[PDB]
Design a protein around this ligand. Structure first.
Ligand SMILES: CCCCCCCCCCCCCCCCCC(=O)OC[C@H](CO[C@@H]1O[C@H](CO[C@H]2O[C@H](CO)[C@H](O)[C@H](O)[C@H]2O)[C@H](O)[C@H](O)[C@H]1O)OC(=O)CCCCCCCCCCCCCCCCC
Ligand SMILES: CCCCCCCCCCCCCCCCCC(=O)OC[C@H](CO[C@@H]1O[C@H](CO[C@H]2O[C@H](CO)[C@H](O)[C@H](O)[C@H]2O)[C@H](O)[C@H](O)[C@H]1O)OC(=O)CCCCCCCCCCCCCCCCC
Ligand code: CLA
Ligand code: CLA
Ligand code: CLA
Ligand code: CLA
Ligand code: CLA
Ligand SMILES: CC1=C(/C=C/C(C)=C/C=C/C(C)=C/C=C/C=C(C)/C=C/C=C(C)/C=C/C2=C(C)CCCC2(C)C)C(C)(C)CCC1
Ligand SMILES: CC1=C(/C=C/C(C)=C/C=C/C(C)=C/C=C/C=C(C)/C=C/C=C(C)/C=C/C2=C(C)CCCC2(C)C)C(C)(C)CCC1
Ligand SMILES: CC1=C(/C=C/C(C)=C/C=C/C(C)=C/C=C/C=C(C)/C=C/C=C(C)/C=C/C2=C(C)CCCC2(C)C)C(C)(C)CCC1
Ligand SMILES: CC1=C(/C=C/C(C)=C/C=C/C(C)=C/C=C/C=C(C)/C=C/C=C(C)/C=C/C2=C(C)CCCC2(C)C)C(C)(C)CCC1
Ligand SMILES: CCCCCCCS[C@@H]1O[C@H](CO)[C@@H](O)[C@H](O)[C@H]1O
Ligand SMILES: [Ca+2]
Ligand SMILES: [Cl-]
Ligand SMILES: [Cl-]
Ligand SMILES: [Mg+2]
Lengths: 30, 455, 342, 61, 37, 342, 79, 38
C-alpha cells in the first residue's frame, strides 16, 4: 500500500516541525 | 525577551551552533537528557528495524538472501530456529522487536524530560547524581557502576547458553543445531591464550574462536572481570602514576572512549568477515574465504564425477588444479583459493585428516548435502554492487544480493575509521584545552619567539 | 641502590627532556622513537630491494615477476613485488624462511617494508600532534595528514585483509600501481563508486582551490618592490603586517562570481581549504577499504530494456566491456574455476 | 478475548502520536504547566495500560 | 511476515526505521527557528 | 561621458549583483547555451543513431549514465551546424545526428574564452594583477587539448569524450587500453600537479587553522578575525618552526607560498595537455622497446609493464566491437584473448 | 542596490506570485513527457521503437551528407 | 512585499522537504519502469 506508507511518513514527518512551530507560536522555551 | 537571553547561544557559551553540543560539557542535567535520549534512539532502531525485517521476512528463503542483519543476531542466540538454521517460529523475533520498541519510548521520555524540563545541572539537586569531570574519584565510581552493568550483560549471554535454551551451534555433531552449553571453557590458559594469538593468517587473534564452549567461558571471565573491576573502581581512586599520565576532563574522557570504540569497530569488521561460529554462515551467508573454498570443492566434485583423478591432476602452472600443498605441507584446495586454506567450516571438515584434505575421503565420502552446501555458498559469495546487484563487478542485472557480511563489515569499517578521526580530534583538543591554548597562540607570549632558532 | 635510583631517575629525565626538546633541528619525540627506526628499516630495505631483489612469485603459481633494476627494470617498470599468494595473510618475517633466497623468492621484502612503513607513518601522524603540543599550537594538522595515512593503509593493509592476501596489496612501484588500479576497476567498478567520485572531487577541487587561493593572494600583493626585483622580497619572514590586500582580493572574487560566493573571513577560507581535500581523501580511502569487503561500485549493466526485452546499452555497458577485458586477462595462469571470488 | 485487540493497539498508536507531540510542547511551554503535568501523568498511565492490554490481548488473536 | 493480527499495521512498520534520521533533521529545523544563535 | 560607446561601457560596468562587462556579451550566452545544451540532451536526447546507446533520463538512464554523446564516426570533424548540409535545418535530425555535441563543445569553448576575459576585465577594473586569469589558462589548455585537438587528430569527433559521467569513465579506460596513457610521463606530471595541488590546499589550510593567534575569547575561533585588520591572523614564525622540525623544510615567505600554490596544479594540467596533443596523433608512450625485445626472446621474463599490456589487449578486444560500432567488428569467440578459466 | 533574496522569498507577495508559476511550470514539464511530445521534438525512440521485430541491428548512421535521409529510412522501417 | 512575514526557517524546512520528495521519487524510479533492469 504505497498510499498508506506515504500517509504514515507524512504524519510522522510533519510531527517534528509541528512541535517546533507550536512552540514558536507559544513563545516557548526553544 | 531577547534572542540572546538564554545560555543557548554562542554569546553565552563560546561555542557556535555547529558545535552546540559542546555547550553541554558542564550542564550535567541536560547532558544526562542527551545521553538517555540517544540511548532511546539506539533502542528504537533495534526494535523498529527488527519489526521491519520480520514484516519483510520470507521464512523459506535464507536470511542472507533478504537483507537481514538483526534476525541473524537473534537466531544465533538460539531463538526461533532449529536444525540447519531453519526458522521454526518467528514469534521470538517479534518479541525482541516489540520489547525494544516499547522500551525506547521510556528512554525517550526520560531523555526529553532531563533535556528540556528537569534540572539543567544536577549538583545542586543531588551530590550522588551530580558530578565534576575533574573529580577523579567520582569519575571512577560511575565507571565502576557501568563496569558492573556490563559484566551482568556478559553473564546474561552465559545464562542464555547454559540455562535458557542454549545457542545456535553451526558445529553441532550431525549438523548445525541449537545446543545447550554445559562445559564452558574456564581454563585461563585457553581463554587468555586467544588474546596472545597473532592477528595474522592462520592465527587470527580472538577472531579465530571456533567453538561455543570457548565463547561461553570467555563471557564468564569477562563478566567476573568487569564486576571485579567495577567494584575496584568504586572503592579506589586513581594512583599517582595514572594521575600524572592522563588528561582529566570531560573531553579527554570522551576521546579515550572514541579510541576504544574505534578499535572495537575494526575488531567487529574482522569478526563478521572471517568468523563463522558466532556469525553462522546459515544466517549471515558464507565468508569470502568460505565461498572461494566452496567453488574449488564444487568443481572438484563435478570433475571427479566425470572421471577426473583430482589428486594427480596437474594444472597449467604445475601446481595441482584441484589439490596442492600449503607452505607447510598440508593438502589444500588449488587455484587462487590457495590463499584461503586457513578456512574451516562444518561442511568441509569431514574431508580433512591429520595431513589436510584426505584424498580417500574426497574419493569416497562426499555426501550430497556437502555438494549442496558448496554450491549454495559458491553462488552466494559476498560480492555485489552498492545497488545490490549480486555477483562480480561485470555481472549483468538479475540477482538482488549483497551479503550481510559485506554490509556489516563495510559499515563498521567506516564507523571505526571516523571514530579514530574523532579520537584524534578530541584527544588533541583536550590536550590543548587543558594546557590553555586551544583558542590560539597568545600574541604577547608566543612560545616560539622565546626559543633559540633552529639554525 | 639507595640514591643510585635517583641518579638513574634524573638520567632518565635528561633523556626525556632531550627526546621532547623543542630545540632539536628535527623533532624526535616519543612517536619519533618508534618512527625513526621503522622508517629507516623500511627505506633501507626498499632501496636495496628496488635495485637488486630477484623475481618474486607474487601470485603463488611459481611464475616470478621481476621488479628490480638489476633484473631488467627501469624506474617506470620497477617495483618491490607483493608477497606470494601461497602466503596469503600469513606473517612472513625473515626468520620464518629457511634462507634469504627463499625469503626473496616469496616476496618477503614487501611485507617487511609495508609493515615498517605503516608503523612509521602512523607515528609520523602522532608526531605531528606531539610537536604542535610542545609548540603551543592548535592540534589538528595531524587530522589532515590522517587522510593520506588512511589511503596508504587502505591499499597496503585493508584491501589485502578483505581479499585474504598481501599478494593483492598495491605493489611498491609505478607500473605496479597502475596494475593494481586496472585490476581494481575490473573487480570492483571503482569508477562507478560514489566514494571514489568524492575522491576525485577532492583532488580536482583541491587542485582548483590551491590555484584559486594562490592566484587571489598573489593578485593582491601590496607593492613593496621595483620591477627589477622579485615581488617575493616584498614580504619579510615574521613581519606583523599582512602582505596582501584581502579586501581587494574579495572585491575581485565577489565580482567574478557574486559577492556572497566569496570568503571575506580568512579563517573560514583556510578551514575550507583544509576540509575539502581532506574529506574527499577520507571518502576515497573508505572506498578502497569497503570495496575491500566487496561492496562495489554501482552496477547498471543491462539496466535499460526496451518494450520487447532487448537490452539497450548505455555508457555503463561500455564500461562493462572494458572491465571484462581486464578481468579475463589479469593473472592469466592463476584461475582454474569460472568465478574470480577474491 | 475478542479481536477488540485491533482497537486497543489503534488507541495505543493514536495515544503515542498525541504524546510524541504534546509532551515536548508541554515541557517547553510557559503557561498551563499545572494542567499539562496532570495530563502527561494520565496519558503516560493510559499508555502503559494499553501496552499491557495489547500484550495480553496478543495471545487471543 | 508479522503475525496476521498485526498485518494492517504493515505500512507503518515499513516507515518506522527511518524515524531516527528525522531526529537529526529536526535538530536543523530547531536551530533554524532560533537563528543558529 | 558622451558617445554611445562610452555610455554602453558605463552600463556594462555598473556595480551590480551579477557583473556583466564587455566580456559578458560573449560569456553569458555561450555558458548558458553550453550548460543548457547539456541539461537538454541528458534529459531528452538519445545516442541510438550515433552509438547504439540510450543516454537520457527520458530513456531510463540515471545521473551517472546520461550523456550528450559524440556524433557518429561517419560525420568526420563536421561542425554539424544546425543549418549545415547534414541536418539541413531539421532540429530533430540534428539531435539524432549528434549536433548537440558540437553545439556544447563550441559554445563551451567560446564561453571559457569569455570567462577568462571576465577574469581580465574585473581584475583591471578593481586594480589587481590578473593571476587568476593566468591560472585559468590550465583548464583552458585541458579543455582545448582533450575536447578539440584530440578528436581533430583522430578519425572524427566520435572519439572525443562524450559529455557524461559514465561516458567519461569509458574515455579513461579507452585511453588506458589503446594509448597506455598511464605510462605517459606527461600524464604522470599532470597527476603530480593535481595531487600536489590537493596536498598544498590541505596542508596550507590546516597550517593556518592550527597556528592561529588567540584573537577572541570564543572556543569557535572564526569570529576572531577582522577583514580590515593589519595583522596576520596566524603565526608564520610558529608554522615555519613546526614544519622545519617535522618535515625538514618549511615555507618562510608567504608570497612564494601562494605563488607556488598556483604554480603546481597549473603546471601539472599544462603538462597533461601536452601529452594529450601527442595522443591525438597516436604518438603514445605505449612501449619500452628494450622490455619488448627481452620479453620476446625470454619467455620467463615478466614485469608489471608486460602485465599491464595484457590487460590493455583485453580491453581492446573486449570493448572495441560495441565501442566502435562503425567498424562492424565481429570477433569470433575463439579469437578473444582470455586467461585460464575466466 | 537590489533587494536581498531573503527579504524576497519571505514575503507573501513573492509566494502569491510563485504559488501559481512554479506549479504551472512543473505541470507543463510533466505534460511535455506524459503526452509524448518530448519523443517527437527530440527524435528519441519510445521503448517499442529501438528495433523492428525481425532485425536486431543498430540503425547506425554511416553516411555523412545523406545522414538525415538515412535516419528517415531507419524510421520508416519501424511499424 | 515586506520580507520576514513568512519565517525563513519555515521556508527552508518546506523547501528542503520538497527536495527530499523529488529526489526520493527519482530513486523510486531507479527500481520501477525504465532503467529498473526489469
Ligand atoms: C593501544 C593499541 C593501539 C594500536 C596498536 C596496534 C598494534 C597492532 C595493530 C594490528 C594491525 C593489523 C594487523 C593485521 C590484522 C589482520 O590481518 O586482521 C585479520 C584478523 C583475522 O585474521 C583471520 O582470522 C581467521 C579466523 O578464522 C578461522 O576461525 C573461524 C572460526 O569460526 C573460521 O572457522 C574461519 O574459517 C577460520 O579461518 C583466520 O585465522 C584467517 O587466516 C586470519 O587471516 O583480524 C583480527 O585479528 C582482529 C582485528 C585486527 C585489527 C585491524 C585494524 C585495522 C585498523 C585500520 C586503520 C585505518 C586507517 C586509520 C588512519 C588514521
Ligand atoms: C589556444 C586556445 C584558444 C581558444 C580556443 C578557441 C576555439 C575556437 C573554435 C575553433 C574550431 C576549429 C574547428 C576545426 C575543424 C577541422 O579542422 O576539421 C577538419 C578539416 C578536415 O576534414 C577532415 O579531412 C579528413 C581528410 O580528408 C582528406 O583526405 C581524404 C583521404 O584521402 C579524402 O581524400 C578527403 O576528400 C580529403 O579531404 C577526413 O575526410 C575527415 O573526415 C575530415 O573531417 O580541416 C578543416 O576544416 C580546417 C583544417 C585547417 C585549419 C585547422 C586549424 C584549427 C585546428 C588546429 C588543430 C589541428 C589538430 C591537428 C592534430 C594535432
Ligand atoms: C560518542 C561520539 C561523539 C560525541 C559524544 C562527540 C561530541 C562532540 N563533538 Mg565530536 N566527533 C566524533 C564523535 C563524537 N563527538 C567523530 C566520530 C568525529 C569525526 C567525524 C567527530 C568530529 C568532531 C569535530 C570536527 C568537532 C566535534 C565537536 C564535538 C562537540 C560538539 C558536537 C556538535 O554539536 O555537533 C553538531 C552536529 C552536527 C553539526 C551534525 C554533523 C552531521 C555529520 C557531519 C554528517 C552525518 C551524516 C549521516 C551520518 C548520514 C547522512 C544523513 C543525511 C540526512 C545527510 C561535542 C562535545 C566539536 C568540538 O570540538 O567541540 C569542542 C567539533 O568541532 N566532533
Ligand atoms: C542525538 C542527537 C542530539 C541530542 C539528544 C541533543 C540534545 C541536546 N542538545 Mg544538541 N545538536 C544536535 C544533536 C542532539 N542534541 C545536532 C545534530 C546539532 C547541530 C544542528 C545540535 C546543536 C545544538 C545546539 C546549538 C544546542 C544544542 C542543545 C541541546 C540540549 C538542549 C536542547 C534544547 O534546549 O532545545 C529546545 C528545543 C525544544 C523545546 C523543541 C523540542 C525538542 C524536543 C526534545 C523534541 C522531542 C521530540 C520527540 C519525538 C518527543 C518524544 C516524546 C515522547 C517520548 C513522549 C539537549 C541536551 C542546546 C544546549 O546545549 O543547551 C544548554 C544548544 O544550545 N544542540
Ligand atoms: C542513566 C539514566 C538515568 C539517570 C542517571 C537518571 C537520574 C536521575 N533522574 Mg531520570 N529518567 C530516566 C533515566 C535516568 N535518570 C529514564 C529512562 C526516565 C523515564 C522513566 C527518567 C525520568 C525521570 C523523572 C520524571 C525524574 C527523574 C529524576 C532523576 C534524578 C533523581 C533519581 C532518583 O532519585 O531515583 C531513585 C531511584 C529509584 C527509586 C530506583 C530506580 C530503579 C530503576 C527504576 C530500575 C533500574 C533497573 C535497571 C538498572 C534498569 C536498566 C535499564 C536499561 C536496560 C536501559 C536523578 C538525577 C527526577 C528529577 O530529576 O528530579 C529533579 C525526576 O523527577 N528521571
Ligand atoms: C572501561 C573499562 C575500564 C576503564 C576506562 C578503566 C580505567 C582505569 N583503570 Mg581500571 N580495570 C578495569 C576496567 C577499566 N579501567 C577492569 C575490568 C579491571 C579488573 C581487571 C580493572 C582493574 C584496574 C586496576 C588494578 C587498575 C586500574 C586502573 C585504571 C586507571 C588507569 C588505567 C591505565 O593506565 O590503562 C593503561 C594501560 C597501561 C598503562 C598498561 C600498558 C598497556 C599496553 C602498553 C598496551 C596494550 C595494548 C593492546 C593492543 C591491548 C589489546 C591486546 C592485548 C590484550 C594483548 C584508569 C582510570 C589503575 C588505577 O589507578 O586504579 C585505581 C589500576 O591500578 N583498573
Ligand atoms: C556571442 C554569443 C554567441 C557566439 C559566439 C555563438 C557561436 C556559435 N553558435 Mg550560437 N547562439 C547564440 C549566441 C552565440 N553563439 C544565441 C543567443 C542563440 C539563440 C538564438 C544561439 C543559437 C545557436 C544555434 C541553434 C546554433 C548556434 C551555433 C554556433 C556556432 C556556429 C555559429 C556561426 O556559424 O555563425 C555565423 C554567423 C556569424 C559569424 C555572424 C557574423 C556577422 C557578420 C560579421 C555581420 C555581417 C553579416 C551580413 C550582414 C550577412 C548577410 C547575409 C546575406 C548575404 C544573406 C558558433 C560556435 C551552431 C552550432 O553550435 O552548431 C554545432 C548552431 O547550430 N548558436
Ligand atoms: C514509534 C511509533 C511512533 C513514534 C513516532 C516518532 C518518535 C516520531 C518522531 C518524528 C520526528 C522526530 C519527526 C521529525 C521530522 C523532521 C523533519 C521533517 C526535518 C526536516 C528538515 C529539513 C527539510 C531541513 C531543512 C533545512 C533547514 C531547516 C535549515 C538548513 C537548510 C536545510 C534545507 C537543510 C508513532 C507515534 C508514529 C506511533 C507508533 C509507532
Ligand atoms: C533532546 C533533543 C533532541 C533529541 C531527542 C530525542 C533523541 C528524543 C528521542 C525520543 C524517542 C526515542 C522516542 C521514542 C518513542 C517511541 C514510541 C512512542 C513507540 C511506541 C510504540 C508503539 C506504539 C508500538 C506499537 C506496535 C505494537 C505494540 C505491536 C507491533 C505493531 C506496532 C509497532 C504498531 C533533538 C535531536 C531533537 C534536538 C533537540 C534536543
Ligand atoms: C569474551 C570472549 C573471549 C575472551 C575475551 C577476553 C578475556 C578479553 C579480554 C580482553 C582484555 C584484557 C583487553 C585489554 C585491553 C587493554 C588495552 C586496550 C590497553 C590500552 C592501553 C592504553 C590505551 C595506554 C595508552 C598509553 C600509552 C601506551 C603510553 C602511556 C600513556 C597512555 C596511558 C595514554 C574469547 C576471546 C575467549 C572468546 C570469545 C568471547
Ligand atoms: C540546447 C539548445 C538551445 C538551448 C536550450 C537551453 C538554454 C536549455 C536550458 C535548460 C535548463 C537550464 C535546464 C535545467 C535543468 C535543471 C535540472 C534538471 C536540475 C536538477 C537538479 C537536481 C536533481 C538537484 C540535485 C541535487 C544537487 C545538484 C545537489 C544538492 C542535492 C540534490 C540531490 C538536490 C537553443 C534553444 C538555444 C537552441 C537549440 C539547442
Ligand atoms: C566598436 C567600437 C566602435 C566605436 S566608433 C565611435 O563611437 C563613438 C561613441 O563613443 C562615436 O562618438 C564616434 O563617432 C564613433 O566613431
Ligand atoms: Ca545568551
Ligand atoms: Cl595482472
Ligand atoms: Cl581458481
Ligand atoms: Mg524508472
Amino acid at each position: 500500500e504505497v498510499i498508506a506508507q506515504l500517509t504514515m511518513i507524512a504524519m510522522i514527518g510533519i510531527a517534528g516541525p509541528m512541535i517546533i512551530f507550536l512552540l514558536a507560536v507559544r513563545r516557548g522555551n526553544l | 525577551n531577547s534572542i540572546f537571553a538564554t545560555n543557548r547561544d554562542q554569546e553565552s557559551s563560546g561555542f557556535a551552533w555547529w558545535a552546540g553540543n559542546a555547550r553541554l560539557i558542564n550542564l550535567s542535567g541536560k547532558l544526562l537528557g542527551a545521553h538517555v535520549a540517544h540511548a532511546g534512539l539506539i533502542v528504537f532502531w533495534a526494535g523498529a528495524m527488527t519489526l521491519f525485517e520480520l514484516a519483510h521476512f520470507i521464512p523459506e528463503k535464507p536470511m542472507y538472501e533478504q537483507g537481514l542483519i538483526l534476525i541473524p543476531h537473534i537466531a544465533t542466540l538460539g531463538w526461533g530456529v532449529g536444525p540447519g538454521g531453519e526458522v521454526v517460529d518467528t514469534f521470538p523475533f517479534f518479541v525482541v522487536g516489540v520489547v525494544h520498541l516499547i522500551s525506547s519510548a521510556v528512554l525517550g521520555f526520560g531523555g526529553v524530560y532531563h533535556a528540556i524540563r528537569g534540572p539543567e545541572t544536577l549538583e545542586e539537586y543531588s551530590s550522588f547524581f551530580g558530578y565534576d569531570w575533574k573529580d577523579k574519584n567520582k569519575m571512577t565510581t560511575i565507571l565502576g557502576f557501568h563496569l558492573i552493568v556490563l559484566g551482568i550483560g556478559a553473564l546474561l549471554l552465559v545464562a542464555k547458553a547454559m540455562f535458557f535454551g542454549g545457542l545456535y551451534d553451526t558445529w553441532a555433531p550431525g549438523g548445525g543445531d541449537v545446543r545447550v552449553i554445559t562445559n564452558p571453557t574456564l581454563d585461563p590458559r585457553v581463554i587468555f591464550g586467544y588474546l596472545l594469538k597473532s592477528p595474522f593468517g592462520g592465527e587470527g587473534w580472538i577472531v579465530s574462536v571456533n567453538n561455543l564452549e570457548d565463547v561461553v567461558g570467555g563471557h564468564i571471565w569477562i563478566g567476573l572481570i568487569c564486576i571485579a573491576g567495577g567494584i575496584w573502581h568504586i572503592l579506589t581512586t586513581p594512583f599517582g602514576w595514572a594521575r600524572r599520565a592522563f588528561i582529566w576532563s570531560g573531553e579527554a574522557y570522551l576521546s579515550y572512549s572514541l579510541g576504544a570504540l574505534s578499535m572495537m569497530g575494526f575488531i567487529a569488521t574482522c569478526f563478521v568477515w572471517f568468523n563463522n561460529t558466532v556469525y553462522p554462515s546459515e544466517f549471515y551467508g558464507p565468508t569470502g574465504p568460505e565461498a572461494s573454498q566452496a567453488q574449488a570443492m564444487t568443481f572438484l566434485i563435478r570433475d571427479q564425477k566425470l572421471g577426473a583423478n583430482v589428486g594427480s591432476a596437474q594444472g597449467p602452472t604445475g601446481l595441482g588444479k584441484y589439490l596442492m600443498r600449503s607452505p607447510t605441507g598440508e593438502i589444500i584446495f588449488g587455484g587462487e583459493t590457495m590463499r584461503f586454506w586457513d578456512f574451516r567450516g562444518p561442511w568441509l571438515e569431514p574431508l580433512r585428516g591429520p595431513n589436510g584434505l584426505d584424498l580417500n575421503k574426497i574419493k569416497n565420502d562426499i555426501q550430497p548435502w556437502q555438494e549442496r552446501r558448496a554450491a549454495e555458498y559458491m553462488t552466494h559469495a559476498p560480492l555485489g554492487s552498492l545497488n545490490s546487484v549480486g555477483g562480480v563487478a561485470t555481472e549483468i542485472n538479475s540477482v538482488n544480493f549483497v551479503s550481510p557480511r559485506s554490509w556489516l563489515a563495510t559499515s563498521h569499517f567506516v564507523l571505526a575509521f571516523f571514530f579514530l578521526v574523532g579520537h584524534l580530534w578530541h584527544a588533541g583538543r583536550a590536550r590543548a584545552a587543558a594546557a590553555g591554548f586551544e583558542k590560539g597562540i597568545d600574541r604577547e607570549s608566543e612560545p616560539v619567539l622565546s626559543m633559540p632558532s633552529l639554525d | 641502590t639507595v640514591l643510585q635510583r635517583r641518579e638513574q631517575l634524573n638520567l632518565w629525565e635528561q633523556f626525556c627532556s632531550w627526546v621532547t626538546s623543542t630545540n632539536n633541528r628535527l623533532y624526535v619525540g616519543w612517536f619519533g622513537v618508534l618512527m625513526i627506526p621503522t622508517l629507516l628499516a623500511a627505506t633501507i630495505c626498499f632501496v636495496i630491494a628496488f635495485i637488486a631483489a630477484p623475481p618474486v612469485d607474487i601470485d603463488g603459481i611459481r611464475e616470478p615477476v621481476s621488479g628490480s633494476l638489476l633484473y631488467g627494470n627501469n624506474i617506470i617498470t620497477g617495483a618491490v613485488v607483493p608477497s606470494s599468494n601461497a602466503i596469503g595473510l600469513h606473517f612472513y618475517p625473515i626468520w620464518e624462511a629457511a634462507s634469504l633466497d627463499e625469503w626473496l623468492y616469496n616476496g618477503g621484502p614487501y611485507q617487511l617494508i609495508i609493515f615498517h612503513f605503516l608503523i612509521g607513518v602512523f607515528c609520523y601522524m602522532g608526531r605531528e600532534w606531539e610537536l604542535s603540543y610542545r609548540l603551543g599550537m592548535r592540534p589538528w594538522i595531524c587530522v589532515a595528514y590522517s587522510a593520506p595515512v588512511a589511503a596508504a593503509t587502505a591499499v597496503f593493509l585493508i584491501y589485502p585483509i578483505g581479499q585474504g592476501s598481501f599478494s593483492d596489496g598495491m605493489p611498491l612501484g609505478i607500473s605496479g600501481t597502475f596494475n593494481f588500479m586496472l585490476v581494481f576497476q575490473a573487480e570492483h567498478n571503482i569508477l562507478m563508486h560514489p566514494f571514489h567520485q568524492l575522491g576525485v572531487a577532492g583532488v580536482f577541487g583541491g587542485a582548483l582551490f590551491s590555484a584559486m587561493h594562490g592566484s587571489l593572494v598573489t593578485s593582491s600583493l601590496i607593492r613593496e618592490t621595483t620591477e627589477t626585483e622579485s615581488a617575493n622580497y616584498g614580504y619579510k619572514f615574521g613581519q606583523e603586517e599582512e602582505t596582501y590586500n584581502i579586501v581587494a582580493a574579495h572585491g575581485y572574487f565577489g565580482r567574478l562570481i557574486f559577492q556572497y560566493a566569496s570568503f571575506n573571513n580568512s579563517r573560514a577560507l583556510h578551514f575550507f581549504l583544509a576540509a575539502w581535500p581532506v574529506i574527499g581523501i577520507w571518502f576515497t580511502a573508505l572506498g578502497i577499504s569497503t570495496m575491500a569487503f566487496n561492496l562495489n561500485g554501482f552496477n547498471f549493466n543491462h539496466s535499460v530494456v526496451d518494450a520487447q526485452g532487448n537490452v539497450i546499452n548505455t555508457w555503463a555497458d561500455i564500461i562493462n566491456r572494458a572491465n571484462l577485458g581486464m578481468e579475463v586477462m589479469h593473472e592469466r595462469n592463476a584461475h582454474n574455476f569460472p568465478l574470480d571470488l577474491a | 478475548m475478542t479481536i477488540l485487540f485491533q482497537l486497543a493497539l489503534a488507541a495505543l498508536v493514536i495515544l503515542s502520536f498525541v504524546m510524541v507531540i504534546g509532551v515536548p510542547v508541554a515541557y517547553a511551554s510557559p503557561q498551563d504547566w499545572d494542567r499539562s503535568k496532570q495530563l502527561i501523568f494520565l496519558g503516560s498511565g493510559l499508555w502503559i495500560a494499553l501496552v499491557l492490554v495489547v500484550g495480553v490481548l496478543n495471545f487471543f488473536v | 511476515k508479522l503475525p496476521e493480527a498485526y498485518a494492517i499495521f504493515d505500512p507503518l512498520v515499513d516507515v518506522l526505521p527511518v524515524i531516527p534520521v528525522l531526529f537529526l533533521a529536526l535538530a536543523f529545523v530547531w536551530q533554524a527557528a532560533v537563528g543558529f544563535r | 561621458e558622451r558617445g554611445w560607446f562610452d555610455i554602453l561601457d558605463d552600463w556594462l560596468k555598473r556595480d551590480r549583483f551579477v557583473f556583466v562587462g564587455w566580456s559578458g556579451i560573449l560569456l553569458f550566452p555561450c555558458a548558458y547555451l553550453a550548460l543548457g545544451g547539456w541539461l537538454t540532451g541528458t534529459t531528452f536526447v538519445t545516442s541510438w543513431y550515433t552509438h547504439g546507446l540510450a543516454s537520457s533520463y527520458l530513456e531510463g538512464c540515471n545521473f551517472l549514465t546520461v550523456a550528450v554523446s559524440t556524433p557518429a564516426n561517419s560525420m568526420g570533424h563536421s561542425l554539424l551546424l544546425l543549418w549545415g548540409p547534414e541536418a539541413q535545418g531539421d532540429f530533430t535530425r540534428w539531435c539524432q545526428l549528434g549536433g548537440l555535441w558540437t553545439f556544447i563543445a563550441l559554445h563551451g569553448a567560446f564561453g571559457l574564452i569569455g570567462f577568462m576575459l571576465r577574469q581580465f576585465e574585473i581584475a583591471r577594473l578593481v586594480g589587481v594583477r590578473p593571476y587568476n586569469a593566468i591560472a585559468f589558462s590550465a583548464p583552458i589548455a585541458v579543455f582545448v587539448s582533450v575536447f578539440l585537438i584530440y578528436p581533430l587528430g583522430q578519425s572524427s569527433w566520435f572519439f572525443a569524450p562524450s559529455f557524461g559521467v559514465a561516458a567519461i569513465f569509458r574515455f579513461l579506460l579507452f585511453f588506458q587500453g589503446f594509448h597506455n596513457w598511464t605510462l605517459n610521463p606527461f600524464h604522470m606530471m599532470g597527476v603530480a600537479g593535481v595531487l600536489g595541488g590537493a596536498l598544498l590546499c590541505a596542508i596550507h589550510g590546516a597550517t593556518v587553522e592550527n597556528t592561529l593567534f588567540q584573537d577572541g575569547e570564543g572556543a569557535s575561533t572564526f569570529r576572531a578575525f577582522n577583514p580590515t585588520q593589519a595583522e596576520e591572523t596566524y603565526s608564520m614564525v610558529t608554522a615555519n618552526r613546526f614544519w622545519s622540525q617535522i618535515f625538514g623544510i618549511a615555507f618562510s615567505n608567504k608570497r612564494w607560498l601562494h605563488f607556488f600554490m598556483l604554480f603546481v596544479p597549473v603546471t601539472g594540467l599544462w603538462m597533461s595537455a601536452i601529452g594529450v596533443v601527442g595522443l591525438a596523433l597516436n604518438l603514445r608512450s605505449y612501449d619500452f622497446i628494450s622490455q619488448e625485445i627481452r620479453a620476446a626472446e625470454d619467455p620467463e621474463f615478466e614485469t608489471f609493464y608486460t602485465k599491464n599490456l595484457l590487460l590493455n589487449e583485453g580491453i581492446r578486444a573486449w570493448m572495441a566491437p560495441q565501442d566502435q560500432p562503425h567498424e562492424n567488428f565481429v570477433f569470433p569467440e575463439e579469437v578473444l584473448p582470455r586467461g585460464n578459466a575466466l | 542596490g537590489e533587494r536581498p533574496f531573503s527579504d524576497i522569498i519571505t514575503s507573501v507577495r513573492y509566494w502569491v506570485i510563485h504559488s501559481i508559476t512554479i506549479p504551472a511550470l512543473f505541470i507543463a514539464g510533466w505534460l511535455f513527457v506524459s503526452t509524448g511530445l518530448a519523443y517527437d521534438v527530440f527524435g528519441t525512440p519510445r521503448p517499442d521503437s529501438y528495433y523492428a521485430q525481425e532485425q536486431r541491428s543498430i540503425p547506425l548512421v554511416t553516411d555523412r551528407f545523406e545522414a538525415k535521409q538515412q535516419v528517415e529510412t531507419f524510421l520508416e522501417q519501424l511499424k | 512585499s515586506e520580507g520576514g512575514r513568512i519565517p525563513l526557517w519555515i521556508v527552508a524546512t518546506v523547501a528542503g522537504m520538497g527536495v527530499i520528495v523529488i529526489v526520493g521519487l527519482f530513486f523510486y524510479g531507479a527500481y520501477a519502469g525504465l532503467g529498473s533492469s526489469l
